[PDB]
Amino acid sequence: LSDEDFKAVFGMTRSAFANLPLWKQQHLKXEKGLF
Amino acid sequence: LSDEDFKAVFGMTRSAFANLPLWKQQHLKXEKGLF
């Protein structure tokens, strides 16, 4: 994922995603079908 | 996009758009069918 792709996929920046708890990162990526 | 193209597609200025919450930027670009 490029930085723009984080915005397109998750509606937040790469660094905002990285600020989420681990379980939430895993679940959001689960929801999108990503690994 | 050209300045006038941007205004026609989004109905707002570049600055206004960039100042929106990121989730809303993404949803507007969902709504417009850009991707």
Curated annotation (Swiss-Prot), chains A, B:
Function as written in the Swiss-Prot or TrEMBL entry: Epithelial cell-specific Ca(2+)-regulated actin-modifying protein that modulates the reorganization of microvillar actin filaments. Plays a role in the actin nucleation, actin filament bundle assembly, actin filament capping and severing. Binds phosphatidylinositol 4,5-bisphosphate (PIP2) and lysophosphatidic acid (LPA); binds LPA with higher affinity than PIP2. Binding to LPA increases its phosphorylation by SRC and inhibits all actin-modifying activities. Binding to PIP2 inhibits actin-capping and -severing activities but enhances actin-bundling activity.
Known tissue expression: Specifically expressed in epithelial cells. Component of brush border microvilli.
Highest rank taxon of the organism: Eukaryota
Organism listed in the record: Gallus gallus (Chicken)
Stretches for region Absolutely required for activity: 29-32
Protein location: Cytoplasm, Cytoskeleton; Cell projection, Microvillus; Cell projection, Lamellipodium; Cell projection, Ruffle
Disulfide bridge map: none
Lineage: Eukaryota, Metazoa, Chordata, Craniata, Vertebrata
Listed name of the protein: Villin-1
Subunit details: Monomer. Homodimer. Associates with F-actin; the association with F-actin is inhibited by tropomyosin.
Family: Belongs to the villin/gelsolin family.
Free-text description of this protein's post-translational modifications in UniProt: Phosphorylated on tyrosine residues. The unphosphorylated form increases the initial rate of actin-nucleating activity, whereas the tyrosine-phosphorylated form inhibits actin-nucleating activity, enhances actin-bundling activity and enhances actin-severing activity by reducing high Ca(2+) requirements. The tyrosine-phosphorylated form does not regulate actin-capping activity.
Entry remark concerning the domains of this protein: Consists of a large core fragment in the N-terminal portion and a small headpiece (HP) in the C-terminal portion. The core fragment is necessary for both actin-nucleating and -severing activities, whereas the HP binds F-actin strongly in both the presence and absence of calcium and is necessary in actin-bundling activity. The Gelsolin-like 1 repeat is necessary for the actin-capping activity. The entire core fragment is necessary for the actin-severing activity.
